[PDB]
Design an enzyme around this catalytic site. Structure first.
Site, mmCIF file in Angstrom:
data_model
loop_
_atom_site.group_PDB
_atom_site.id
_atom_site.type_symbol
_atom_site.label_atom_id
_atom_site.label_comp_id
_atom_site.label_asym_id
_atom_site.label_seq_id
_atom_site.Cartn_x
_atom_site.Cartn_y
_atom_site.Cartn_z
ATOM 1 N N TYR A 166 35.799 11.798 35.578
ATOM 2 C CA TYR A 166 36.464 13.033 35.206
ATOM 3 C C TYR A 166 35.497 14.235 35.161
ATOM 4 C CZ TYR A 166 38.644 16.561 32.325
ATOM 5 O OH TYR A 166 39.087 17.764 31.824
ATOM 6 N N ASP A 210 66.460 18.072 18.430
ATOM 7 C CA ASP A 210 65.196 18.792 18.448
ATOM 8 C C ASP A 210 65.344 19.799 17.310
ATOM 9 O OD1 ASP A 210 63.163 19.449 21.137
ATOM 10 O OD2 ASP A 210 63.117 20.834 19.477
ATOM 11 N N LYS A 216 57.351 9.376 26.610
ATOM 12 C CA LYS A 216 56.263 10.234 27.053
ATOM 13 C C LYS A 216 55.008 9.400 26.798
ATOM 14 C CE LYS A 216 54.762 14.828 25.695
ATOM 15 N NZ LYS A 216 55.582 15.485 26.731
ATOM 16 N N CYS A 230 47.494 8.531 27.453
ATOM 17 C CA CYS A 230 46.440 7.873 26.706
ATOM 18 C C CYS A 230 45.414 8.857 26.138
ATOM 19 C CB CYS A 230 45.760 6.836 27.598
ATOM 20 S SG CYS A 230 44.768 5.607 26.693
ATOM 21 N N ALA A 241 47.390 13.617 32.836
ATOM 22 C CA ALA A 241 47.214 12.169 32.895
ATOM 23 C C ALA A 241 48.452 11.534 32.275
ATOM 24 C CB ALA A 241 45.967 11.763 32.151
#
Ligand SMILES: Nc1ncnc2c1ncn2[C@@H]1O[C@H](CSCC[C@H](N)C(=O)O)[C@@H](O)[C@H]1O
Length: 291
Positions: free
Chosen positions: A22, A95, A169, A172, A200
């Site tokens: 990365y 929500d 959703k 990591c 990611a």
């Protein structure tokens, strides 16, 4: 140009056949190329998920409980699609923020302005009884602690709601910000076309058979694999121009999108898959007011 020939796109995380260290500098790179791209990312992944369930005969007559649903503009499209297909489904969108008014006034959709907690999850479970529940979660608080807090909540959503399927959703935590090893539901790690340039994030799709709830542990070492696999995909894969892809747009994300859309069901009969996909993408972009 970055041209290449590819048989198919990476549909799931485990398919990513390469990794890259990365580069933090990539965070300064433009995250989005399309307007309303976020809603698009969500619409494709969610259309893919629900189509799979339709295919398995478990969508009709279910109540989709969408937590972290606002504004939810794209949800109107999803609602219209199955509604026009003759599929019976009730939507319950919860929500604490306000939903796009286009969702208002449909007897099949209930909008709720509430931040959910374990307690509320139990009250809705008591009130939805005995309908079958399909859960979709897109809640967002992020620090690692914020993430763990969210994932912890999604697991409670499933233990209490006890859905026949779930879409969560999933991102990591970064390895250099590791806190503690945790568990997440078992499901396919669905890759997301049109996600931000260096995201990611993915969608974890699960179908629940019997009364078992399988989980999988995630450790810092996995977090390292997630980082390198997702970095290689974003930096390399998504920047590919698939020349053997005969379509108005040959960029990887459109190739990846084509593969998800070809699984969607329509009322209109087409001569080819290219014709259906073109149709679906056109409709989608028009609805979202995308060029
Ligand atoms: N406990 C909770 N219950 C419900 N929504 C929550 C929540 N914690 C965070 N959220 C919601 O998660 C949302 C993240 S953005 C989600 C976007 C939405 N899925 C759409 O398609 O546009 C926010 O609107 C936020 O209020």
């Amino acid at each position: 140009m970055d041209v290449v020939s590819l048989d198919k796109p990476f549909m799931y995380f485990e398919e990513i056949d390469n990794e890259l260290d990365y580069e933090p500098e990539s965070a300064n790179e433009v995250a989005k190329k399309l307007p309303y791209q976020g809603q698009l990312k969500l619409l494709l992944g969610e259309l893919f998920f629900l189509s799979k369930l339709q295919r398995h005969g478990i969508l009709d007559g279910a109540t989709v409980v969408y937590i972290g649903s606002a504004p939810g503009t794209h949800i109107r499209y999803l609602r219209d699609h199955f509604y026009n297909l003759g599929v019976i489904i009730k939507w319950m969108l919860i929500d604490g923020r306000h939903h796009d008014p286009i969702l208002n006034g449909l007897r099949d959709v209930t909008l709720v302005t509430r931040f959910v907690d374990e307690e509320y999850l139990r009250s809705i479970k008591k009130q939805l009884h005995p309908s079958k529940i399909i859960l979709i979660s897109d809640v967002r608080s992020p620090s690692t602690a914020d993430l763990l807090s969210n994932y912890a909540l999604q697991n409670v959503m499933i233990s209490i709601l006890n859905p026949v399927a779930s879409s969560l959703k999933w991102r990591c935590p970064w390895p250099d910000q590791w806190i503690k090893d945790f568990y997440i539901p078992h499901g396919n790690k669905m890759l997301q076309p049109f996600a931000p340039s260096y995201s990611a994030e993915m969608r974890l799709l699960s179908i629940y058979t019997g009364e078992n709830m399988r989980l999988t542990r995630v450790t810092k070492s996995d977090a390292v694999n997630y980082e390198k696999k997702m970095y290689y995909l974003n930096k390399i894969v998504r920047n590919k121009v698939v020349v053997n892809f005969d379509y108005p747009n040959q960029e990887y994300d459109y190739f990846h999108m084509y593969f998800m859309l070809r699984t969607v069901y329509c009322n209109k009969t087409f001569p080819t898959t290219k014709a259906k996909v073109l149709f679906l993408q056109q409709s989608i972009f028009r609805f979202l007011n995308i060029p």
